[PDB]
Design a protein around this ligand. Structure first.
Ligand SMILES: CC(=O)SCCNC(=O)CCNC(=O)[C@H](O)C(C)(C)COP(=O)(O)OP(=O)(O)OC[C@H]1O[C@@H](n2cnc3c(N)ncnc32)[C@H](O)[C@@H]1OP(=O)(O)O
Ligand SMILES: CC(C)(COP(=O)(O)OP(=O)(O)OC[C@H]1O[C@@H](n2cnc3c(N)ncnc32)[C@H](O)[C@@H]1OP(=O)(O)O)[C@@H](O)C(=O)NCCC(=O)NCCS
Ligand SMILES: [Br-]
Ligand SMILES: [Br-]
Ligand SMILES: [Br-]
Ligand SMILES: [Br-]
Ligand SMILES: [Br-]
Ligand SMILES: [Br-]
Ligand SMILES: [Br-]
Ligand SMILES: [Br-]
Ligand SMILES: [Br-]
Ligand SMILES: [Br-]
Ligand SMILES: [Br-]
Ligand SMILES: [Br-]
Ligand SMILES: [Br-]
Ligand SMILES: [Br-]
Ligand SMILES: [Br-]
Ligand SMILES: [Br-]
Ligand SMILES: [Br-]
Ligand SMILES: [Br-]
Ligand SMILES: [Mg+2]
Ligand SMILES: [Mg+2]
Ligand code: NA
Ligand code: NA
Lengths: 148, 148
């Protein structure tokens, strides 16, 4: 093969940390490769999180991070799509679509109820991506935060 | 120590009584009552490494509970808590059980150096909105679901 979407491994973390650090910069964080790599390795070692990466000609182009959720009402599990990012050079080539296609197949393999996520209301690009992938906008619930 | 009311972490010994309230909570969200199913799933959540249950006991009766679980913020490279489920049985409502449960959840999250406590509640749940606003919670993001 020449392109692949697959689960991340320890061997990928050094290159993946660069993209994870770029993703943090998109949301306003200052670049800090040491901090980004440390936290990426903490999430990678956690049993309930799943990383898929898209590789094209041995370069990581993007990633998706999911984690297990529990629904008390249904008495079943689901997945939360927490982070999705494709590096600018590789955008608009289907990397995010392929990453989400794999996340959907993975969630079906795990008999998940659904994949849920939250994205900024003003993030035009992400809304179009999610709608293309079969996600439905839902405003039944309201989020609240207690800042500590 | 001598006390008559307490908010404390749940133990295996509390699960049989706690399952009654957990079953009522599931019925609040539309599920059919099934004590066996509710208890089985409550025990599965209790056995998740990052889940934290607090229960409120008044005169040896469990009046209510809160269930929190660990969240990871990739942007901040830090952890936070999600307040997933909150419930007080009707006989004990409007006595401060939920306020006391959330007061303890806040102290617990501060002990763990969490960034915040976040939650989602139904947009039509006017009682919960008043509770969360009283406790210091604040109402930018849109939820999407893929039902697989
Ligand atoms: C819940 C969360 O975690 S939200 C996190 C959202 N992530 C971000 O916004 C990070 C910054 N942005 C990015 O990394 C990227 O632009 C992404 C992830 C949004 C898209 O990655 P890409 O690989 O470029 O997307 P891909 O090429 O697979 O596009 C698939 C669909 O997404 C939509 N889309 C992607 N980019 C755009 C864009 N710039 N404008 C409009 N729609 C877009 C389209 O529907 C597109 O289908 P199409 O090309 O046939 O029209
Ligand atoms: C919401 C709920 C947890 C409140 O529990 P509670 O122990 O009765 O609440 P408290 O007595 O601690 O009340 C604290 C504050 O919440 C608000 N509140 C609680 N019940 C309310 C009601 N029926 N109407 C309006 N405000 C209400 C008020 O701000 C109240 O402060 P006040 O009594 O000084 O005015 C309870 O009604 C419940 O279990 N409801 C069903 C499940 C649910 O909605 N859970 C939350 C979503 S998971
Ligand atoms: Br490879
Ligand atoms: Br992984
Ligand atoms: Br659900
Ligand atoms: Br494609
Ligand atoms: Br897999
Ligand atoms: Br569902
Ligand atoms: Br966003
Ligand atoms: Br006790
Ligand atoms: Br125990
Ligand atoms: Br026991
Ligand atoms: Br109820
Ligand atoms: Br849990
Ligand atoms: Br009493
Ligand atoms: Br007593
Ligand atoms: Br009891
Ligand atoms: Br504790
Ligand atoms: Br925060
Ligand atoms: Br508010
Ligand atoms: Mg949940
Ligand atoms: Mg997160
Ligand atoms: Na660090
Ligand atoms: Na930040």
């Amino acid at each position: 093969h020449h392109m692949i979407v697959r689960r991340a491994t320890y061997e990928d973390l050094s290159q993946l940390a660069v993209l994870f650090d770029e993703y943090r910069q998109f949301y306003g964080a200052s670049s800090n490769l040491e901090e980004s790599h440390h936290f990426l390795k903490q999430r990678f070692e956690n049993k309930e999180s799943v990383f898929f990466i898209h590789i094209k000609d041995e370069k990581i182009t993007g990633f998706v991070l999911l984690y297990l959720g529990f629904s008390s009402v249904a008495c079943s599990t689901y997945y939360i799509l927490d982070d999705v990012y494709v590096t600018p050079l590789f955008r608009r080539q289907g990397s995010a679509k392929q990453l989400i296609d794999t996340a959907i197949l993975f969630a079906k393999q795990e008999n998940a109820l659904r994949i849920s996520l939250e994205t900024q209301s003003n993030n035009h690009e992400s809304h179009r991506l999610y709608e293309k992938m079969g996600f439905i906008r839902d405003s039944e619930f309201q989020t609240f935060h207690c800042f500590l």
